[PDB]
Amino acid sequence: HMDPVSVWGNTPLATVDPEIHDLIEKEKRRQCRGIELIASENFTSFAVIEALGSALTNKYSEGMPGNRYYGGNEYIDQIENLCRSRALQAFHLDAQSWGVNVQPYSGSPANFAAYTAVLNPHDRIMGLDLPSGGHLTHGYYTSGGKKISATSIYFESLPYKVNSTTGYIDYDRLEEKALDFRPKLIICGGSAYPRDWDYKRFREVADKCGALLLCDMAHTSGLVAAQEVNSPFEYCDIVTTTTHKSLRGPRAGMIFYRKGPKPPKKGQPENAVYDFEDKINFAVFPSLQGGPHNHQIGALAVALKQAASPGFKAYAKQVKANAVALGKYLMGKGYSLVTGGTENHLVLWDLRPLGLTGNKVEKLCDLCNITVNKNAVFGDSSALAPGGVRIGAPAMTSRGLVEKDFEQIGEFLHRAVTLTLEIQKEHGKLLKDFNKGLVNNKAIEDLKADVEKFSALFDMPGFLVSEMKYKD
Amino acid sequence: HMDPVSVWGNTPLATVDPEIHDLIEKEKRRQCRGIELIASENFTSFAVIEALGSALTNKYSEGMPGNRYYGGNEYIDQIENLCRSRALQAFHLDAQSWGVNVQPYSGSPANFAAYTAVLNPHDRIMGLDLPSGGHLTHGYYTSGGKKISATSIYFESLPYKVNSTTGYIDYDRLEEKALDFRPKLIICGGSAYPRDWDYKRFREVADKCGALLLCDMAHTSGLVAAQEVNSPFEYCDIVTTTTHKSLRGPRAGMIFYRKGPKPPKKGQPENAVYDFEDKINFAVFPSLQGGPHNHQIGALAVALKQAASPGFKAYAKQVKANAVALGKYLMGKGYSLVTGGTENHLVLWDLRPLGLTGNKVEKLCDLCNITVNKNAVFGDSSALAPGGVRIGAPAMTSRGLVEKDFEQIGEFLHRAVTLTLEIQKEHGKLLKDFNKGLVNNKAIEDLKADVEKFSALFDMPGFLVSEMKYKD
Amino acid sequence: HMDPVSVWGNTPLATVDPEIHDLIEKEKRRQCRGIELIASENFTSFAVIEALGSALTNKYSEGMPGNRYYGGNEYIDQIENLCRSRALQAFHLDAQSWGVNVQPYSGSPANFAAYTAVLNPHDRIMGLDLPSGGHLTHGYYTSGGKKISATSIYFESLPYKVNSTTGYIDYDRLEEKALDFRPKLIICGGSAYPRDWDYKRFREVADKCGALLLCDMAHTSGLVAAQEVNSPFEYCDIVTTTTHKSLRGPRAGMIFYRKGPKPPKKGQPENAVYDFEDKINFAVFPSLQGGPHNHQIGALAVALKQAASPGFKAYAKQVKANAVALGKYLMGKGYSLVTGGTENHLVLWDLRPLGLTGNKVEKLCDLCNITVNKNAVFGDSSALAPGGVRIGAPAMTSRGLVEKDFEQIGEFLHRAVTLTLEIQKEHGKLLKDFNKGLVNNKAIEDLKADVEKFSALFDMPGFLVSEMKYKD
Amino acid sequence: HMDPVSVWGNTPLATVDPEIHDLIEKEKRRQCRGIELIASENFTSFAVIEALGSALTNKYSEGMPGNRYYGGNEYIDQIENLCRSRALQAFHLDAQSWGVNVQPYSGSPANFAAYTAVLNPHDRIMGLDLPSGGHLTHGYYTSGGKKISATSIYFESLPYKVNSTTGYIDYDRLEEKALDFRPKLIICGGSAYPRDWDYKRFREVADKCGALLLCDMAHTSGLVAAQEVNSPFEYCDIVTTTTHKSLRGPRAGMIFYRKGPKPPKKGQPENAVYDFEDKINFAVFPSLQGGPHNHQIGALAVALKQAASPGFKAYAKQVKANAVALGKYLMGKGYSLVTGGTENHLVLWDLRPLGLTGNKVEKLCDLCNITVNKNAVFGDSSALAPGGVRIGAPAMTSRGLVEKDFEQIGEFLHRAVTLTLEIQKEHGKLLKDFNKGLVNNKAIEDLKADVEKFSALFDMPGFLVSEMKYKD
Ligand SMILES: Nc1nc(O)c2c(n1)NC[C@H](CNc1ccc(C(=O)N[C@@H](CCC(=O)N[C@@H](CCC(=O)O)C(=O)O)C(=O)O)cc1)N2C=O
Ligand SMILES: Cc1ncc(COP(=O)(O)O)c(CNCC(=O)O)c1O
Ligand SMILES: Cc1ncc(COP(=O)(O)O)c(CNCC(=O)O)c1O
Ligand SMILES: Cc1ncc(COP(=O)(O)O)c(CNCC(=O)O)c1O
Ligand SMILES: Cc1ncc(COP(=O)(O)O)c(CNCC(=O)O)c1O
């Protein structure tokens, strides 16, 4: 005989699965008692999380609102229509000129569907090279020729790079490359580029070689919504994004695409209109995905409502101000930030002049409750032992930190990188040797203690710190 | 000035976003006051949903446990390790012989990653034709030559079919086709095939043509874990699955793959071992996906713990018994079931002897709170007006229904299709004619009420019905 | 110092290069002192050979007549124009309905250009399976899955097969395969198919699945021109051919293509016209080839004039009558011919009932100055050790042989195969054993001498036997 | 009844086809009464033409010597073995370190076969851009993105370019491109590059990106054999060539490839040997070609014997000296030669400083019995109305012309380009206007008369002028 429904189906997680409950509680503590500096991370709201964790997960709704492959979607259709309208509203787009698909499971699924919509297999793409700051899905293959992203396997990639001495995109070399290589699609936006984008120039290059132009604004989408960085929609045909980075929503993707009359082009027929909508929609489903994750879509609708608030614009300005204040602190100590600063939410920090790799700094930081990620920098031949570390402001800004707080974060990072170098100098560069300095290191314990003291001063979205299992 | 953290970040959904709150509440009522017969749907536990809606959503954790691209993953690593271990445990797999990747965002991402791991672009694949019961992602292009799934775009697909008379897989024709086409990969498992699979014969065919053999058990994975249907692991190299269908977990995908020594095969060196693990992991990340959805992985860990329990085996047994009891009832009313019954959780109902298409039935059912999906059957060209309806037992079985209750479901469907016919007979076969009959039809309203009365008799997992915003 | 022009440039081959001169004389004797039965070989005229060895070899003439990439093509243009017009005249084609490109270097270049003109890489093609009698370039990969022809590498091939009972094309299986596989191009015509083609049925199949229909008439092109076999032009979009087989010209290829209004088709604009010409021309040059071989084109113009003569119709009738007479003679001795006879210039002889493979027969025959080729038959998994031999009538018919002479050839082959049996019986079935019977075998020497005595009874085109260097 | 063999088969071309005979005679007069300056043309020997027009055309010989798919190849095998050995001897190659395939039908088939041997579809290649001097088959697509050569369709091409100011290959930019694009194959050699090649630098670049290195020596093959330009064999993996340009043979191609021990490289095993042979042979047949053209192979063996003689080295020296003397003359008149001279057999003449396109010079020259070809120059978008004209020395040097004779050719060209200018000034630049200036032009008739008088002074290889039909 079956269990009663209530026993398996209505009993709380803390009773059904104490192990997973306990680990989530440990993760909750970790999230609010360290300094979380991964530039792609945020702390989303409790309201988002309540939508995310809901009966919306139970629904199959393949297709489009009002034209589904399954019955029962009366309310799912309203949620998805609301999410789409809030997505357009959040970025101040007119529905006559822009549509959006909110079904991508994540950012990488959003980009692959966008590419599948407008490209045939082996069509040519160019995006920012990963060590220059571009994303995996922008066509990444290594300088040794190893195809890493499937966007370099199913499509033909030729990346463009930053200037090797300034760290800024070399728009002249971008243009010359696009004219030689003749891409069908040029991708802009990136994962570790600390400056804004001259989308107008990208449009000029795309028009000179007849390419489509797509912006992936995943990292800065919240800053775009808040009108705090350049808008890609003014110049790009398609804009993809994640929703969980600076937009501060659930993990999901969106694809924005132009609709309606095309701008005037020579030879182009009169009355020409954009043709993205049906192809984008079809590429997401049925080409690539299956059932939408409606709990993500519902949670995303919440997040887009929250991103369209006056409070969110001030958040986005604070993120930029915090990144700049951090950047100034680090550069004052002599740390090598790419481009010597930032115009967005992140800094990219070249550790090679110190004789360090990013994995060592990431590991030492981790032991002090400082959460970063190692990161490739220009000319790197390793991702797991790269020459850089990347620091972002969104997550801690979401806990309310301001510029002086991010100067203190800079001080903690200076202490952490100093300690990293000291350990390497005393114990050596090999990881087996370096790891010996990570044990019973009083300076690690001091820095960890200072970090948690600091972290505990601030509020925390998403859950009630007062109610967590693991207390101070 | 920024908003206080608590206002945007800790306030409940019901206050932050009353529209989305209200829409979720309406969907909760719909789920527990209708008859939910989509074969791919289930009702998952509250405990799963609590892990799904949690701070795990905030974490970036690309890579493998213990070897990540980001700091801060000490607990996320334990959660993913626990999830992988429980996945092996739930299917009684020896870790020396099988591994599993639990990062796929959903079923379609799991399949595309499995394909990408073992196939080059344009390599040949054979799966069950969609009108014969196979899935979109098994290489679906239409009988008109339209490439629908991206599996038929990036790879070269040729489907195998069921016998056009019996509805069973024609294993002789499968073999002839495999030796002609010479696929690199043969896929078994399906979405609407009401019978079990002779995996041993699939292995014999794969071995004769030199193909890899992959089973997609998405639909029956819960039945497989409970050992209530044939096990694909006995004969398949790779097993993909979703976790939200009969497995009753969150929406996610899993890829199982063989490890360790290869079985004796002539022309193969001694001491040869499987090489799937690294290709599978790399295909999931960094080839295709980005950050894992750790809230999904934690929720999946809960579901896998729930699936290994003795109560789950009783559940899987009951799902099968309910499907059989419903099939016997419908056949007793003279309806046409593909293969004349079922061996799993679903029945496939051919409506063409009745002069109906499944969109008519799905819509009529929908206005009566009977949630089904139209379904292609053999020879169909239209997906949006196909010849069949698919009915599955997992979701209502999870509410505690047994065989006599599924006989009542059978009578409700019999009433539903009878009324669909009368609407057609009275108003017309052209959809615009037929749709006249769906306006203030007292017989629809009566059937809808009766369905609600029946549904209200049963418990409901995932949320407390006594607590929902909308009652009677 | 520069040699004087006359010493290197005007001295006859016999003086400049006695080795090659001598080898050519040895080959000349071989050609008129053996029985030459390779079905794709012919003996072309001295007039063709005089054009072939001419100053036309010196000219670069890329492009089209009157629109070349080089100067000096006044006369090359008239030659190519004359060749094209003669090609249309030889097949009784209306220039308003058919065009022809005569630049392909050989048959395989002609086919690859035709495919390149109308297909993208990886588009699907269906041709007759090589063991069923199809050609390499029709998409050959082996029953072991090895891609042999580039047509199966750059395109996606799936062959259709003969019925194993009758040896004829199975047209219902062809249709079913075409409807399953959905080729963009269906190829008909073959290399070892001894029967005619139902081009009308091929057209019905191609129309049903939306495919282009190409006939490769290389082997029977001379019989087509003489209206002695079915005309592919009645039903095919494109007809490719070599010119050195039954057409009895130089080695070259030709692509014929439809021009002008398309036939009425529901699902086709009015006034729709064929669009092959420019694609076919462009695929030949500049896509694939370089400079035309103008000596070949001149020689081809000669051959096309000869093919359009009353004597050539009598020759084509004789080729067919000789093939039938040979087939009946062999079949009267108890041998197995695929399909039980022939309707064209060749017979396909299945040696497996005798316990023989074609290499053994081919090698024994070769030692006896009987020139055949081993040939795959239905079921074969080896090309260098296949189960059949192919025999053709064009070359010996061109020396003037008539039916009674081909009955004598039949008796020579009967002696050859009988001796092959006796060697195998005496020495063994393994090749290392069998080859011991080929050394100092008086019976081979006797058969060789009898073959030469018979062969010397007949005239010989292309050169004068009375003037060859190596006399009897 | 059939015609007698003698009537159709042994009768001379003059009787069988007076039309083709007459047209060939007209071409013969044109070849020895004008100035033939197409850099890719030559006048081959009578001995070559006698082998070309021989019974060798009748033989099918698919396969390799001693391992054929047909009987009867005793003498064809000896001819092909001899050709290959003479090919290695002509280029001073040790058979232990180099092999050659002499079956390619022409230059473009040779290159496509070499590519097919070592590349998969869509693998990356880099060749000299066509306007910079590279060949079509080196991956040519236009600056507008139109794929012209199939080598840019079946493979992924990114050309390298000359320095726009100097006309010389920019080896630094080649290296940067190669490191960014990561080609599998780098091609060197070209069609209109007037300088020698730094094969060492190409090898350094190929090694830095892990590419194969192929040289297409078609144009300068004869200069390479005579050791009068740099040898590509010192540094290249594969060397392809035509045989009809400076090598002065029939129209055919060859593919040379390394054999035996590989050069030392860390990571490469000891005892590593090259593996090109089987792949190259297989790519030629059975992958791409069908039956070898044995008359071309036999003719090629003759040409290779002639090329290995002492007079040929003097010929190759004279070719280079004549091209230089011609170049100096044109520059002395103020004309603009790409790179301001030549190190090989050709000059590339930029007409754009004159306000002329090459088609006008080609047409006017053609009316004056001066055979040139228009040629793309750097930055050209048009090939039929390009910016340049290309002049080569091989053909007229073969008639015995020396430097003073090529200075008169320079004067004839000066007169011709002067005349082209006068006509364009008088009648206009639109083709319809310019062409009317080509009628009743006394300066054209005077220059034509002078050209014929000059041309009649010289001997002529390949046929006896004293014997032609159209005497002067
Ligand atoms: N119907 C029909 N269609 C045609 O197109 C033709 C025809 N008849 N007759 C004449 C001619 C045959 N041309 C062919 C036919 C097939 C193949 C072909 O399949 N070649 C593979 C296998 C070769 C093989 O058999 N190897 C041994 C082992 C010993 C060893 O490999 O040395 C083994 O595997 O047993 C390879 O090269 O790998 C190559 C050339 N031809 C067109 O020209
Ligand atoms: C066999 C099979 N495989 C994969 C999937 C894809 O799962 P996602 O939707 O998570 O991408 C499905 C979904 N089938 C849904 C249905 O049959 O209604 C499936 O049936
Ligand atoms: C520009 C960009 N685009 C797309 C993605 C993909 O999102 P998913 O991980 O959801 O697939 C990322 C993730 N970048 C993660 C990081 O920069 O740390 C990104 O930076
Ligand atoms: C470098 C090069 N390679 C290959 C070829 C092709 O040869 P075929 O034409 O035989 O295919 C050419 C011909 N180039 C002709 C010219 O430069 O005028 C060539 O110049
Ligand atoms: C039908 C067919 N098509 C094309 C070709 C190719 O012709 P080339 O060899 O000129 O490339 C052949 C050659 N078949 C050779 C044989 O049957 O013996 C052929 O049989």
Residue numbers in the entry:
A (entry chain C), B (entry chain D), C (entry chain B), D (entry chain A): 0 to 471
Text taken from the publication that reported this structure:
SHMT catalyzes the reversible conversion of L-serine and THF into glycine and 5,10-methylene THF. SHMT is highly conserved in evolution, utilizes pyridoxal 5-phosphate (PLP) as a co-factor and can accept polyGlu-THF as a substrate (Matthews et al., 1982; Schirch and Strong, 1989; Strong et al., 1989). Previous structural studies of soybean SHMT8 have provided detailed snapshots of the enzyme, representative of different stages of its multi-step reaction: the resting state of the enzyme with PLP; the enzyme bound to the PLP-Gly intermediate; and a ternary complex of the enzyme with PLP-Gly and the substrate analog FTHF (Korasick et al., 2020). These structures showed that, similar to SHMT from other eukaryotes, soybean SHMT8 adopts a tetrameric assembly, verified in solution by small-angle X-ray scattering and analytical ultracentrifugation (Korasick et al., 2020).
In this study, we have determined the crystal structure of soybean SHMT8 in complex with diGlu-FTHF and PLP-Gly at 1.7 Å resolution. A superposition of the polypeptide chains in FTHF and diGlu-FTHF complexes yields a Cα root mean square deviation (rmsd) of 0.48 Å over 1892 residues, highlighting their overall structural similarity. In the SHMT8 complex with diGlu-FTHF, we identify an additional conformational change of the THF-binding loop specifically associated with the presence of second glutamate moiety (Glu2) of the ligand. The loop closes in more tightly against the bound diGlu-FTHF. In the diGlu-FTHF complex, the Leu383 sidechain (chain A) packs against the ring of Tyr68 (chain B), making a potential CH – π hydrogen bond (Brandl et al., 2001). Another hydrogen bond is found between the sidechain of Ser381 and a backbone oxygen of Glu2. In addition, two hydrogen bonds are formed between the backbone amides of residues 382 and 383 and the γ-carbonyl of the first glutamate moiety (Glu1). A water-mediated contact is found between a carboxyl oxygen of Glu1 and the sidechain hydroxyl group of Tyr68.
